Ligand binder design. Structure first.
Ligand SMILES: *C(=O)N1C[C@H](NOS(=O)(=O)O)CC[C@H]1C(N)=O
Length: 262
């Protein structure tokens, strides 16, 4: 528990961590360039791609999407609620990020982003050449060791998140929406957020494949007093198909990474 190698050994699996202090440049890396399953964590970038489409076509966020005749994907807490009358594109983006909504992700990749291929192209176009999304929900969650489908690296995820808040892709209006969505994420209280002092503000997106004990979290962290953000990216997976994940391992890794870049 005092260092990342000991956390990983006791977890019995693979832990990948990249953190950077965007003010000082201090970074921390542990298997930062190895591949891990994305699970739900791509959904933050999907929401950002929808924001960019609206940036490039003002009004997209208010277009309405109807899906009355759909069999809703498991883990669709918002889209199942609104099925009777549809949802605005911007609320689908908010739902897929803040609630990890699976229906919202597939709907947006069916009608706006051009499938998993289009998701990958968006990431590629901002300079992320590690990210690949290959399949739809929920098959993208298989998390098979050695399978590079639907994977990225901890460092690539961190760097892409930084790009999305550092004026390289989204204008300041759309960046602010993206950052408010991340800060309002509902699913991360037991991961990176569990490692930060009260008073710091965290915007994060989690992922939990349900296979191979695979779970992750990436975030920007605002210490306050106008400090530049910390970026943290933490991915884990294990060898056995039905092994369970462990939130506390991610939180322990977060404490180490924060200590080394703060
Ligand atoms: C994403 O990985 N998922 C969607 C949903 N949210 O859990 S999450 O916040 O950790 O991402 C349920 C688990 C998982 C899935 N089975 O799709």
């Amino acid at each position: 528990n005092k260092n990342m190698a000991d956390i990983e050994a006791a977890f019995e699996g693979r832990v990948g961590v990249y953190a950077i202090n965007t003010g000082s440049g201090k970074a921390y890396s542990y298997r930062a360039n190895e591949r891990f399953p994305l699970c739900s964590s791509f959904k933050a970038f999907l929401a950002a791609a929808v924001l960019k489409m609206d940036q490039d076509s003002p009004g997209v966020l208010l277009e309405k999407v109807n899906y009355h005749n759909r069999t809703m994907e498991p883990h669709s807490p918002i889209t199942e609620k609104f099925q009777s009358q549809g949802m605005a594109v911007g609320e689908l983006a908010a739902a897929t990020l803040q609630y990890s909504d699976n229906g919202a992700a597939n709907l947006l990749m069916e009608k706006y982003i051009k499938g998993p291929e289009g998701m990958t192209q968006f990431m590629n176009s901002i300079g992320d050449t590690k990210f690949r999304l290959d399949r739809w929900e929920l098959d993208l969650n298989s998390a098979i060791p050695g399978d590079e489908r639907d994977t990225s690296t901890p460092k690539a995820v961190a760097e892409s998140l930084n790009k999305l808040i550092s004026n390289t892709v989204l204008d300041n209006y759309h960046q602010e929406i993206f950052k408010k969505w991340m800060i309002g994420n509902t699913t991360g209280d037991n991961r990176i957020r569990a490692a930060v002092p009260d008073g710091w503000v965290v915007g994060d997106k989690t992922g939990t494949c349900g296979k191979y004990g695979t779970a992750n979290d990436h975030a920007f962290i605002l210490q306050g007093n106008n400090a530049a953000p910390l970026i943290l990216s933490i991915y884990t997976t294990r060898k056995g198909e039905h092994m369970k994940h462990d939130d506390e391992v991610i939180a322990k890794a977060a404490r180490i990474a924060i200590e080394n870049v703060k």
